[PDB]
Design an enzyme around this catalytic site. Structure first.
Site, PDB file in Angstrom:
ATOM      1  N   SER A   1      49.195  37.038  39.053  1.00 59.43           N
ATOM      2  CA  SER A   1      48.195  36.064  38.658  1.00 59.43           C
ATOM      3  C   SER A   1      46.791  36.605  38.901  1.00 59.43           C
ATOM      4  O   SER A   1      46.526  37.261  39.907  1.00 59.43           O
ATOM      5  CB  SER A   1      48.400  34.745  39.398  1.00 59.43           C
ATOM      6  OG  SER A   1      49.441  34.008  38.784  1.00 59.43           O
TER       7      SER A   1
ATOM      8  N   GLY B   1      45.673  44.068  30.559  1.00 57.21           N
ATOM      9  CA  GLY B   1      45.635  44.917  29.390  1.00 57.21           C
ATOM     10  C   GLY B   1      45.669  46.404  29.639  1.00 57.21           C
ATOM     11  O   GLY B   1      45.622  46.876  30.768  1.00 57.21           O
TER      12      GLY B   1
HETATM   13  C1  NA4 Z   1      44.049  45.083  35.073  1.00 56.44           C
HETATM   14  O1  NA4 Z   1      44.421  44.746  33.719  1.00 56.44           O
HETATM   15  C2  NA4 Z   1      43.287  43.884  35.737  1.00 56.44           C
HETATM   16  C3  NA4 Z   1      42.127  43.368  34.898  1.00 56.44           C
HETATM   17  C4  NA4 Z   1      41.766  41.939  35.249  1.00 56.44           C
HETATM   18  O2  NA4 Z   1      40.582  41.552  35.159  1.00 56.44           O
HETATM   19  O3  NA4 Z   1      42.682  41.181  35.587  1.00 56.44           O
HETATM   20  N1  NA4 Z   1      42.879  43.971  37.145  1.00 56.44           N
HETATM   21  C5  NA4 Z   1      43.661  43.720  38.197  1.00 56.44           C
HETATM   22  O4  NA4 Z   1      44.871  43.520  38.110  1.00 56.44           O
HETATM   23  C6  NA4 Z   1      42.919  43.807  39.513  1.00 56.44           C
HETATM   24  C7  NA4 Z   1      41.551  43.532  39.588  1.00 56.44           C
HETATM   25  N2  NA4 Z   1      40.861  43.427  40.733  1.00 56.44           N
HETATM   26  C8  NA4 Z   1      41.535  43.599  41.859  1.00 56.44           C
HETATM   27  C9  NA4 Z   1      42.888  43.885  41.893  1.00 56.44           C
HETATM   28  C10 NA4 Z   1      43.498  44.423  43.133  1.00 56.44           C
HETATM   29  C11 NA4 Z   1      44.356  43.639  43.876  1.00 56.44           C
HETATM   30  C12 NA4 Z   1      44.628  43.978  45.187  1.00 56.44           C
HETATM   31  C13 NA4 Z   1      44.042  45.100  45.745  1.00 56.44           C
HETATM   32  C14 NA4 Z   1      44.295  45.452  47.076  1.00 56.44           C
HETATM   33  O5  NA4 Z   1      43.633  46.397  47.556  1.00 56.44           O
HETATM   34  O6  NA4 Z   1      45.169  44.807  47.696  1.00 56.44           O
HETATM   35  C15 NA4 Z   1      43.196  45.876  44.998  1.00 56.44           C
HETATM   36  C16 NA4 Z   1      42.925  45.540  43.695  1.00 56.44           C
HETATM   37  C17 NA4 Z   1      43.592  43.991  40.715  1.00 56.44           C
END
Ligand code: NA4
Ligand code: NA4
Lengths: 140, 91, 91, 140
Positions: A30, A89
């Site tokens: 999510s 994406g």
């Molecule tokens: C990839 O398609 C997506 C794009 C979006 O805007 O949803 N990005 C992610 O899935 C995403 C974006 N920001 C942070 C994180 C993530 C989650 C957890 C950690 C962690 O260090 O635990 C880092 C990054 C994922």
């Protein structure tokens, strides 16, 4: 005249497709905070006199259908078209709650030849999504 | 007669092939920045210059923090893809 | 600290997936327009705006002519890919 | 300051790779007119005070080697960098006289971490090449 004519009766549409929860099958988590985005955008574009419309958790089929429908509307009185996509994406691909759709397909409904009411008018597409897995370390 | 692919502007949150960062309580870096710049310069700057400000903000004031070295201290740069024929002002 | 992908600008003669036109005697439509616009505005306009004129000129003033029905009457639109952080002026 | 610093001692380099003739093995035809472009650019950037350098009919290996060398040069006194490519090509690809070279490869030499003399400086790439076989039919 070197700038777009923006004095039509209405600024135009602003479709905000906000996908938060994906089907178990997609393997996507999510997108927390995305509601802060969709809300922030909505207000912003409302202040710019755009007719805003939000959509949440649409399937890839729903997204295509929606576009096909919005491109069939008459935009003669609208100065422009804005479409914000918020979801998962990859390069050239955005995710519908139930799966992937390549941008090309939902963008094509809007070219000069297919959507005449918008020909010669600015069609903006803002995309918040990953374009692959590369991470940028930085420098300096 | 004009090209069919003309008059399109694709404002991407990140460069080709890269990841895009989102904050759990503040929203994605790109979107909160895009909205902030619009709020301040929609009535002064042409659109391409506004997206350039958005670009600088995202690249300058954002970095990822994680207990996992893999996702720690990562950076991001938005990507403006313009095929616009004229200058764009929201006023 | 800044992204390693920042501060690049790619000025494509045509759009993704498309063909690009070259004239046997006058050279490519893209390049001849770019040079023309540079000669006239490098001392007055910001680079993204200059490139926007290059866009209009190519979209507006050019069109292929050929005896081959397939190569005849085609159009073209340049594609600006910016990851610039600031405004660029050649002066 | 929302504008790049261009008051360095010199505006920078402007490498113009101009490929007109391709190896029989590639099946590519001669790019008639490419010289008119090459000269047109040389003059334009000369007036803009760039240190223009022309190159003709380079192989793919040569192009990479040249780009590798230009980035190992010191650009401390230069304000920016400009590289023009004139050749055949497809999406994400440009042809050497003997074959294709993925664009990513030649541009990587210039990212923040790889070429520190140009970090924080505008790296412009101008490409006159086909990005595929599609033909735009136009509208209106
Ligand atoms: C990839 O398609 C997506 C794009 C979006 O805007 O949803 N990005 C992610 O899935 C995403 C974006 N920001 C942070 C994180 C993530 C989650 C957890 C950690 C962690 O260090 O635990 C880092 C990054 C994922
Ligand atoms: C595609 O990679 C290249 C890119 C370039 O800058 O050369 N373009 C062509 O090969 C190209 C561009 N414009 C025109 C022509 C062409 C060649 C032959 C005919 C003909 O009627 O025989 C028409 C147009 C090729």
């Amino acid at each position: 005249d070197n700038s777009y004519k923006m004095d039509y009766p209405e600024m135009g549409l602003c479709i905000i497709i906000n996908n938060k929860n994906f089907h178990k099958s997609t393997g996507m988590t999510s997108r927390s905070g995305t509601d802060v985005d969709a809300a922030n955008l909505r207000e912003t574009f409302r202040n710019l006199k755009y007719e805003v419309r939000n959509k949440n958790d649409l399937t890839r089929e729903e997204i295509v259908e929606l576009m096909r429908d919005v491109s069939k509307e008459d935009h003669s009185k609208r100065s422009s078209f804005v479409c914000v996509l918020l979801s998962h994406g990859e390069e050239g691909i955005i995710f519908g709650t139930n799966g992937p759709v390549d941008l090309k397909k939902i963008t094509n409904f809007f070219r000069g030849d297919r959507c005449r009411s918008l020909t010669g008018k600015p069609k903006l597409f803002i995309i918040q999504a990953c374009r692959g897995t590369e991470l940028d370390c930085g420098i300096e | 007669k004009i090209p069919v692919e003309a008059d399109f502007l694709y404002a991407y949150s990140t460069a080709p092939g890269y990841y895009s960062w989102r904050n759990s309580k503040d929203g994605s870096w790109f979107i909160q920045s895009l909205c902030a710049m619009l709020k301040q310069y929609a009535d002064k700057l042409e659109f391409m210059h506004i997206l350039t400000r958005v670009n600088r903000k995202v690249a300058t004031e954002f970095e990822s923090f994680s207990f996992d070295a893999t996702f720690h201290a990562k950076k991001q740069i938005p990507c403006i893809v313009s095929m616009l024929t004229k200058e764009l002002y929201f006023y």
